[PDB]
């Protein structure tokens, strides 16, 4: 019981931090792949961080939808931006 | 490239889903059929439209073919070359004329 | 702090100029829109070596989406396990700092795709390596869960011994 | 135009495929000719060895 | 709409050209290695046997 509650707990916390880092890297790779698929080569795309206020998610999504003046292949489910991924 | 026909109602949906699932670019030159054709599955003379499309990548082409077949679209091996397309059209026309003749004979015999 | 704040990553071509605020510089327009949402953001990207075919790129994108979903599920499971162990004190997510930095500070940099991760191979190879690492982490989490289950069984046996 | 664009895209794809095939053929030809060029040097070495045997 | 279609066609053509260029670069590296490899192999099999 003590081992599982202390050593296993600490190992799980470290593994969770490592998995979070790996998932962020994988999300970056996926965003790069999408920016190579949606947007056209050669690679010159500019990425932006994901930081946003806790209660401004809907407003930010609406603003991004308004600003997405590209990718008309959809109706005149995936976001029509060059890259769009919401985390946490 | 790929070539096929599909009901003119679902051609816009097919184009949209193809442009969405394949985030990359592709060429689409659909043309509506002149006259409605009796659908085999629907047993109705619904409208039709062409499904001509061209894209690179063998896996991408296979996925596009699978998606088109998923939407009850029948495809044919249309020759890109004008001479080959003309030869295929002539062969199809001769086969269709022979089929028309034998169909007329069979229908007349059955009716009699 | 506001660790509970959501995160939405995005990217756009260098020639982009959003029509929401026409005439504004791309960074300036983003900041004003971010200021419109009272938000902030910074550049974070790494030039991948993926030069595969369009079909290969699409297959890699589908695999990457699947792997990202799996990694998110594993991270959520690990966070839930930690919360059960009374570790997620401040919040169920972002409470535990990563790489000696909180979650937003870590998100303020994306140079991790280097050295230990920069295989310099095709996107498929890097994706497979990341998937294997995530599978190893999930196996470690499963081992921790098994240890927790064994501890629970031992505690139940002790309680039955001291039932009355 | 849409039709002109599609025709140009098909022509560009055909040209790119032809260029890739030509580059691969040129690479294979160079790889083969390097040994073929070295074949003359090997024959010269054989002649030199025969001359050395005659001298012995 | 024509601007988007033209941009898509240009991007597809550029992607095809980039794939062909990557294949050509791989073939060129293979040829660069194989030139020395085949020269050495022919030199061995002929000159060393004659020696």
């Amino acid at each position: 019981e003590q081992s599982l509650r202390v050593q296993l707990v600490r190992l799980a916390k470290t593994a969770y931090v490592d998995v979070f880092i790996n998932w962020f890297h994988i999300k970056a790779l996926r965003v790069y792949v999408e920016s190579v698929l949606r947007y056209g080569l050669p690679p010159h795309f500019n990425i932006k961080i994901i930081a946003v206020p806790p209660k401004n998610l809907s407003k930010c999504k609406s603003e991004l939808i308004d600003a997405f003046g590209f990718l008309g292949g959809n109706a005149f489910e995936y976001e029509p931006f060059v890259m769009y991924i919401i985390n946490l | 490239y790929v070539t096929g026909v599909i009901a003119r109602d679902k051609v816009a949906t097919l184009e949209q889903i193809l442009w969405r699932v394949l985030r990359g670019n592709l060429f689409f030159k659909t043309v509506e059929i002149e006259q409605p054709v009796y659908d085999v599955k629907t047993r109705e003379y619904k409208h039709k439209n062409a499904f001509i499309v061209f894209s690179h990548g063998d896996l991408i082409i296979k996925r596009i073919r699978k998606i088109a077949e998923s939407l009850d679209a029948n495809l044919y091996d249309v020759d890109s070359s004008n001479e080959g397309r003309s030869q295929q059209l002539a062969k199809v026309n001769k086969n269709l004329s022979d089929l028309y003749t034998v169909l007329k004979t069979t229908s007349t015999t059955l009716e009699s | 702090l506001y660790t509970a704040n959501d995160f939405i990553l995005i990217s756009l071509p260098q020639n982009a100029q959003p029509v929401t605020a026409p005439g504004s510089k791309t960074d300036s327009w983003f900041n004003e829109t971010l200021i419109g949402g009272r938000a902030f953001v910074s550049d974070f990207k790494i030039p991948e070596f993926k030069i595969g075919s369009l079909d290969t790129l699409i297959v890699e994108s589908e695999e990457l989406s699947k792997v990202d979903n799996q990694i998110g599920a594993s991270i959520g499971k690990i966070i839930e396990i930690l919360q059960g162990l009374n570790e997620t004190s401040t919040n169920a997510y972002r409470t535990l700092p990563i790489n000696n930095m909180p979650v937003p500070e870590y998100l303020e940099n994306f140079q991790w795709q280097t050295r230990k991760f920069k295989l310099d191979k095709s996107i498929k190879d890097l994706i497979t390596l990341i998937s294997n690492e995530s599978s190893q982490l999930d196996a470690d989490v499963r081992a921790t869960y098994a240890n927790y289950n064994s501890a629970k069984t031992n505690l139940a046996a002790a309680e039955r011994k001291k039932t009355g | 135009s849409q039709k002109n664009g599609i025709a140009t895209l098909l022509q560009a794809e055909k040209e790119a495929h032809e260029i890739v095939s030509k580059a691969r053929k040129y690479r294979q030809d160079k790889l083969k000719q390097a040994k073929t060029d070295a074949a003359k040097e090997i024959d010269s070495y054989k002649i030199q060895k025969d001359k050395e045997l005659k001298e012995f | 709409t024509p601007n988007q279609v033209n941009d898509e066609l240009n991007k597809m053509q550029a992607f095809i050209r980039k794939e062909a260029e990557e294949k050509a670069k791989e073939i060129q590296l293979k040829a660069d290695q194989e030139y020395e490899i085949e020269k050495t192999n022919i030199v061995r099999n002929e000159t060393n046997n004659i020696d």
Side-chain angles (χ1 to χ4, degrees), chain B residues 1-7 10-18 20-22 24 26 28 36:
Chain B
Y1 69 97
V2 307
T3 301
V5 302
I6 189 50
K10 297 299 298 297
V11 60
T13 305
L14 188 153
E15 199 280 331
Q16 189 274 331
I17 190 56
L18 194 62
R20 185 59 263 180
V21 70
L22 193 150
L26 58 90
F28 205 78

XYZ file of all heavy atoms in Angstrom, chain B residues 1-38, unseen atoms left out:
251
model
N -5.733 9.929 -62.821
C -7.040 10.570 -62.744
C -8.149 9.531 -62.622
O -7.932 8.346 -62.873
C -7.277 11.457 -63.969
C -7.462 10.692 -65.261
C -8.731 10.417 -65.754
C -6.367 10.252 -65.993
C -8.904 9.721 -66.935
C -6.529 9.554 -67.175
C -7.801 9.292 -67.641
O -7.969 8.599 -68.817
N -9.341 9.984 -62.234
C -10.501 9.117 -62.086
C -11.655 9.705 -62.887
O -11.697 10.902 -63.179
C -10.910 8.926 -60.608
C -9.721 8.462 -59.782
C -11.487 10.214 -60.043
N -12.598 8.837 -63.248
C -13.746 9.241 -64.047
C -14.927 8.344 -63.705
O -14.775 7.125 -63.588
C -13.438 9.163 -65.549
O -12.331 10.022 -65.856
C -14.643 9.595 -66.369
N -16.097 8.954 -63.553
C -17.297 8.204 -63.233
C -18.511 9.101 -63.302
O -18.417 10.296 -63.592
N -19.671 8.500 -63.033
C -20.940 9.212 -63.043
C -21.637 9.001 -61.707
O -21.395 8.022 -60.996
C -21.857 8.771 -64.206
C -21.161 8.982 -65.542
C -22.267 7.319 -64.038
N -22.516 9.945 -61.371
C -23.228 9.933 -60.098
C -24.435 10.847 -60.241
O -24.472 11.717 -61.113
C -22.301 10.374 -58.936
C -22.969 10.157 -57.575
C -21.887 11.827 -59.107
C -23.555 8.774 -57.389
N -25.439 10.638 -59.391
C -26.629 11.477 -59.409
C -26.258 12.940 -59.193
O -25.423 13.269 -58.346
C -27.617 11.020 -58.337
N -26.892 13.822 -59.971
C -26.562 15.241 -59.921
C -26.918 15.878 -58.584
O -26.466 16.992 -58.301
C -27.273 15.983 -61.053
N -27.724 15.206 -57.760
C -28.080 15.770 -56.461
C -26.919 15.679 -55.477
O -26.694 16.605 -54.689
C -29.313 15.061 -55.904
N -26.174 14.577 -55.508
C -25.126 14.313 -54.531
C -23.737 14.730 -54.999
O -22.764 14.490 -54.278
C -25.115 12.825 -54.165
C -26.386 12.344 -53.487
C -26.624 13.082 -52.182
C -25.503 12.823 -51.189
N -25.414 11.384 -50.816
N -23.618 15.342 -56.178
C -22.295 15.688 -56.690
C -21.657 16.783 -55.841
O -20.448 16.757 -55.580
C -22.379 16.083 -58.178
C -23.288 17.287 -58.379
C -20.989 16.355 -58.734
N -22.451 17.757 -55.391
C -21.911 18.809 -54.535
C -21.435 18.243 -53.205
O -20.366 18.620 -52.706
C -22.961 19.897 -54.314
N -22.215 17.334 -52.615
C -21.801 16.701 -51.369
C -20.528 15.889 -51.565
O -19.631 15.911 -50.714
C -22.925 15.816 -50.829
O -24.120 16.594 -50.685
C -22.543 15.232 -49.477
N -20.435 15.163 -52.682
C -19.226 14.399 -52.967
C -18.019 15.316 -53.098
O -16.949 15.027 -52.553
C -19.421 13.567 -54.239
C -18.354 12.546 -54.651
C -18.993 11.438 -55.470
C -17.224 13.188 -55.448
N -18.174 16.432 -53.815
C -17.065 17.366 -53.967
C -16.644 17.940 -52.621
O -15.446 18.041 -52.327
C -17.449 18.487 -54.932
C -16.266 19.253 -55.508
C -15.718 20.297 -54.554
O -16.501 20.828 -53.738
O -14.505 20.585 -54.618
N -17.615 18.318 -51.787
C -17.285 18.908 -50.494
C -16.569 17.902 -49.600
O -15.553 18.224 -48.974
C -18.553 19.432 -49.819
C -18.305 20.254 -48.559
C -18.181 19.402 -47.311
O -18.772 18.327 -47.218
N -17.408 19.881 -46.343
N -17.079 16.669 -49.537
C -16.458 15.674 -48.670
C -15.077 15.296 -49.194
O -14.153 15.047 -48.410
C -17.373 14.444 -48.499
C -16.826 13.522 -47.407
C -17.524 13.673 -49.796
C -16.630 14.204 -46.072
N -14.904 15.257 -50.518
C -13.591 14.962 -51.077
C -12.597 16.071 -50.762
O -11.446 15.796 -50.404
C -13.701 14.751 -52.586
C -12.489 14.114 -53.267
C -12.253 12.715 -52.726
C -12.678 14.086 -54.774
N -13.021 17.330 -50.886
C -12.145 18.442 -50.542
C -11.861 18.509 -49.049
O -10.825 19.054 -48.654
C -12.754 19.761 -51.016
N -12.751 17.973 -48.214
C -12.535 18.040 -46.772
C -11.629 16.912 -46.288
O -10.612 17.161 -45.631
C -13.874 18.010 -46.033
C -13.744 18.187 -44.526
C -13.067 19.507 -44.183
N -11.640 19.345 -43.927
C -10.820 20.334 -43.599
N -11.251 21.579 -43.481
N -9.535 20.068 -43.384
N -11.984 15.662 -46.596
C -11.185 14.533 -46.121
C -9.791 14.571 -46.730
O -8.809 14.193 -46.080
C -11.901 13.195 -46.404
C -11.935 12.884 -47.894
C -11.233 12.064 -45.635
N -9.676 15.027 -47.974
C -8.384 15.235 -48.621
C -8.092 16.727 -48.511
O -8.497 17.524 -49.356
C -8.411 14.747 -50.065
C -7.088 14.609 -50.821
C -7.197 13.500 -51.853
C -6.690 15.912 -51.493
N -7.390 17.104 -47.440
C -7.104 18.512 -47.189
C -6.286 19.142 -48.307
O -6.307 20.368 -48.459
C -6.374 18.670 -45.855
N -5.575 18.339 -49.088
C -4.816 18.852 -50.205
C -5.717 19.270 -51.350
O -6.945 19.176 -51.300
N -5.081 19.749 -52.410
C -5.800 20.244 -53.572
C -6.048 19.124 -54.577
O -5.321 18.128 -54.632
C -5.026 21.381 -54.235
N -7.096 19.302 -55.376
C -7.440 18.347 -56.420
C -8.296 19.051 -57.462
O -8.912 20.085 -57.191
C -8.160 17.122 -55.843
C -9.461 17.337 -55.063
C -10.684 17.296 -55.972
C -9.583 16.315 -53.945
N -8.330 18.471 -58.658
C -9.099 19.010 -59.770
C -10.441 18.298 -59.865
O -10.516 17.074 -59.726
C -8.333 18.866 -61.085
N -11.498 19.072 -60.101
C -12.852 18.534 -60.182
C -13.568 19.215 -61.338
O -13.665 20.445 -61.370
C -13.606 18.753 -58.869
C -14.716 17.773 -58.636
C -14.440 16.489 -58.197
C -16.035 18.133 -58.846
C -15.457 15.582 -57.975
C -17.057 17.231 -58.625
C -16.767 15.954 -58.191
N -14.067 18.420 -62.283
C -14.681 18.938 -63.503
C -15.992 18.210 -63.785
O -16.235 17.718 -64.888
C -13.721 18.819 -64.686
N -16.852 18.129 -62.772
C -18.124 17.434 -62.919
C -19.008 18.116 -63.958
O -19.032 19.344 -64.080
C -18.858 17.378 -61.580
N -19.740 17.299 -64.711
C -20.691 17.780 -65.707
C -21.973 16.971 -65.576
O -21.936 15.740 -65.479
C -20.123 17.679 -67.138
N -23.108 17.664 -65.577
C -24.394 16.994 -65.434
C -24.735 16.205 -66.691
O -24.410 16.613 -67.809
C -25.494 18.013 -65.138
N -25.395 15.060 -66.501
C -25.803 14.239 -67.632
C -26.930 14.930 -68.391
O -27.744 15.664 -67.815
C -26.227 12.835 -67.164
N -26.974 14.696 -69.705
C -27.982 15.341 -70.540
C -29.389 14.880 -70.175
O -30.317 15.694 -70.098
C -27.694 15.064 -72.015
N -29.567 13.583 -69.946
C -30.874 13.023 -69.650
C -30.795 12.130 -68.421
O -29.744 11.546 -68.139
C -31.409 12.214 -70.840
N -31.888 12.013 -67.669
C -31.889 11.108 -66.515
C -31.743 9.658 -66.943
O -32.185 9.252 -68.021
C -33.253 11.363 -65.864
C -34.098 11.918 -66.961
C -33.167 12.727 -67.812
N -31.112 8.872 -66.075
C -30.852 7.460 -66.322
C -31.519 6.644 -65.226
O -31.480 7.019 -64.048
C -29.341 7.159 -66.383
N -32.137 5.531 -65.616
C -32.818 4.660 -64.665
C -31.793 4.037 -63.726
O -31.012 3.171 -64.133
C -33.607 3.585 -65.406
